[PDB]
């Protein structure tokens, strides 16, 4: 009989629903394939190779394999190991008298512990739950990869557009600063013209560099995640506003969304493992029995080996039970119980963190949308203001400074739009990941 | 006799005083209870539940309990373990001749190592200092919790006021943008009015969102630290300028402030542990002695068991001393000495980091006060400028742009005041924590 | 014979060259001594003491020493351990009959495992490669120190100049705000003068504090890295533009630059270690042989000990071979192979990260130079604009606001130049470090 306590799931005090659920889509995030979630064909292609070559995933998938093997050897302790032990012995007197030789060549199993009280059985169950938890950690490593490779690609495309944004503002100032010298001469506060002229163009250059630099940092971080230098045959990609298929993931009930999270099911298996370790410590109060056996030829001389009459066998069953261990037996159980008491608060820590991981992602997608829409219409307005003054200068103006200031306000309000355009895209990848999504590639029946 | 070297505290080269001590209060930070340090009744309430339910603290307090148990079992190696070992044996010839059976059912202790040279004693001392250090780490986990839950609450209240700040600037622009159209018609650089009009209102909306989003992130991080969704029956709280009772903590002498730090006393116990491991390795040059004993009934047949005459006893004291170990004995000691040589530089690393942890907190509270006072009077000035122009527009003005620009300068200079109002509050919680404060709830006799 | 597989270096798919190599210098970064790389005599002095006293380096250099010792004891398993075991035994009847005593005092080696199949040899090789890898990690800890202490010093000097920058802008506003009241009375939009007047001076004060605070944080972090409070006898140092000797490091071929990196050679030794662990598991299919021997005096009474005729000796060679282990033998090898399969993907992860570590440092030094040059000429232009208006106000002006606005634009454009002046300097220290540089102090023959 085994002595492992029944598994009762811990009561994590947490809200039953999220105060930010607005979606109605049937398709769950976990159910949704990432290939049907991420839009950019370039990004879709990148994941397929990274999912095949990523070191962290390769490592995480190997560790789960050795935990399977470590389990398979622990289950083998329930079976007798057969060994062919051939040994010899020899005594003799120092003074120069007599000697004695005994040669035993035989086969036999040494101390098979008959697990009557599920001590080896429970300790083998720990190896299984240890493996089961590692598999879930392998899944968590799978989801963390797709989220990371996506957010690192969004940082690239942002910088791509950040360069081009500062590229054409260097081109639109190019046609104006030469025009500000061929234009009809203005006032003497024209001195307030080359200073912002320089201020616009030389900030635009500093921006292009920062963009071009962060572009490479995203480019290089991508080559690491795919274990390969970036290939050539790739579609030019889509802008940040076209990085996701039109869909917002639902997160129904908190109990529902907990089941999909790998890091959560990894916490219950690591707990079930600690339960098994109790069944091993609780069986220590019980007697342990061990069986020794052997066959073969016993002899005094090598010549007599394997000759008729020398055949012997053995059977030595030895059992034992501790009567007073000075509380050590009680103590080792207490440890096994505390080791398990820590796995329920680790399970609680896992849930409370997992809930927060989602509630933030929901609050972000809501507010990174409202904040983005504001910064976008601001860009449109500042762009419109630029065009109006763009005609004023074309006709009769008292200052290119007006037009020039309008260029910078339109440039700054547009760069601030790209900033929120990325932050919204990044969180979208986190929302998918933290919702358990990214498991399968394609959504199917 | 034991062979553990006497504990001499390492000489950490560090300044004796801090160049930022300005306080004169008798009440030490460590002596000061956090309930008498933190002002907000809402925050005071939050800590009491988090201190009872936090996972990280629950884990840290469990680990110190298993280190007590792991110690209790190591002290038990100084006592003989009694076991009732009943065993049987049986030999026999293969050809079909004779057999032999010997059944021994008895009681006895197996190999009690009489620790004459404090080898088990020292190795048991390591288990104690290991436990003593874990207790100090449990205290460091206690202090880190209060500091974290406080700084996470300040981030909430900041966002609460950040929303309301942008809320009324949306309300004050509301009454002006409708008024800027019903006002008497202005010039043609009125075109320089709706652009900043849009720029003010649409930045205020982007601010409210960022504030409302970071509000939830602080709200969610709070629900994690308390292992519970946030309750309802709570006082509305106090503003950031009312988060601390009027008091600045003193940090007298560097030697003085080192003693209160848990992470420091944890470094000396982890060192004392390494000292104990030397007393075990240094006793390896000495002979180890072991005692075997047993009583019970020896027999050839089960029937004879527990029948008169079968009573036997045993006493096998076996001692041994290594003569030449090929330097392995010297090597294992060298390791034990190096393992201890690393605990003094870990102690040094602990102190040099602990000193920096305080010196920064002192330099910050000084400069986050001077920088805050400047940003605050700037807000007052910009607010005053707004009111003056607020009357100009009310009478005879040539531009709502003046008034409108004054709104944004007053809004920006006020939001920059809240930013420094939080950073000053956060560091205040760190100063208390890094000074050893936060141990007891209430300051007492 | 040993059974450790030959070492074949993994094929890391990575670009052969960097798309940012522009230097032509023969002197490699690794070949270049840091004393000939870092310019500031104050910084050069600081490293020499930190390299002697840093805790993290002291720890890293100790761990490599214990790995040498742990190896030396594993090599000793190939040699017999001699022990002088003197033991006694005693049986007796409970009823009150007969007793029996046997006293054996002798010398002998217990179970020397004759390693015929390189099982101990291979397991000892793992201890060597484990040590070899720790040495490389000790080098990586050496390089990480110089990089860290340099970047922490640049942050200090930045703040030093940041304070002085805001110090003289408080001095130049000092002579103007008293002059703005003694100047001839201006218009009624003079109201648009004290608001930016306050805005300039009160931002300059907030800047000085932030600078003075971050100055101490860099000052304190420096005292930690050198395990000592900062001394006095030190040259005042050089500005950020004078922190490096005029030289840009070359990074020829990717294969070339991989060899200098300590973290890379640490990954191959940790791999070679896993190779050795296979030679131990692959030898488990083979029989293990063990030799027991002893000499000394056997007796029934203590008096007979060491008296003629009692001299006995022993020689018990015992060998054994597992026939069926239920796949456990195959499993333990599979683990040893998977443990090694993980060290090649850890080697791949090491390389892909090491390449990125350099490619970013190259792209940064290129773009942090172009972005810096732009922000610098912007400062010159804004400074020039200030002087021109500085003469306008000196003669006939309609607003100190013009001059006052010119002060802030010149102040802000100069502080933004120092910001890029530091970021460029920091990356320069990382480029040197990530290129394997910082090993030797002085570049030599």
Numbering used by the authors:
A (entry chain A), B (entry chain A), C (entry chain A): 21 to 465
Paper text:
Like TolC and OprM, MtrE exists as a homotrimer that forms a ∼130 Å long α/β barrel. Each subunit of MtrE contains four β-strands (contributing to the 12-stranded outer membrane β-barrel) and eight α-helices (forming the elongated periplasmic α-barrel). In view of the crystal structure of MtrE, it is found that the internal surface of the protein forms a continuous channel. Each protomer of MtrE contributes D402 and D405 to form two concentric circles of negative charges in the inner cavity of the trimeric MtrE channel. Additionally, the distance between the Cα atoms of these aspartates is 16.0 Å.
The membrane fusion protein MtrC, containing 412 amino acids, bridges MtrD and MtrE to form the tripartite efflux complex MtrCDE. This powerful efflux complex spans the entire cell envelope of N. gonorrhoeae and mediates the export of hydrophobic antimicrobial agents, such as antibiotics, nonionic detergents, antibacterial peptides, bile salts and gonadal steroidal hormones.
